[PDB]
Amino acid sequence: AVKYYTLEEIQKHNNSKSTWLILHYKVYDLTKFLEEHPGGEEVLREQAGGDATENYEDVGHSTDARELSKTFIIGELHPDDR
Numbered sequence: 001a002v003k004y005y006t007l008e009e010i011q012k013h014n015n016s017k018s019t020w021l022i023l024h025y026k027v028y029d030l031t032k033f034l035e036e037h038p039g040g041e042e043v044l045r046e047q048a049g050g051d052a053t054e055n056y057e058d059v060g061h062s063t064d065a066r067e068l069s070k071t072f073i074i075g076e077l078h079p080d081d082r
């Protein structure tokens, strides 16, 4: 099965308690990854609650980074909001 979230509910996860963001229509919960991110947490918090696909691809993450990102996927963006 697959869980779908709307932009409306995703935007609510941008506080000290929860940090979600969208990348290529997938929703990631990076709450616990903020302090481990080699790129720092400020760059993630700034994109929280929205689509950060361009900024993500702009930096050109390595293969290993993309493999690791999969562990943080909690669902996908609802088809109606794409």
Ligand code: HEM
Pocket (backbone or CB within 6 Å): 023, 028, 030, 037, 038, 039, 040, 043, 044, 047, 052, 055, 056, 059, 060, 061, 062, 063, 064, 065, 066, 068, 069
């Ligand atoms: C999906 C979660 C993400 C994972 C697993 C992740 C992982 C990493 C890793 C492992 C690196 C080290 C370099 C590399 O291997 O490419 C890195 C660097 C970096 N990340 Fe991320 N990242 C994520 C999302 C993002 C997002 C959304 C942004 C910005 C909007 C971002 C901005 C950066 C920057 C600026 C660097 C440093 C690049 C440099 O020093 O040249 N990352 N990230």
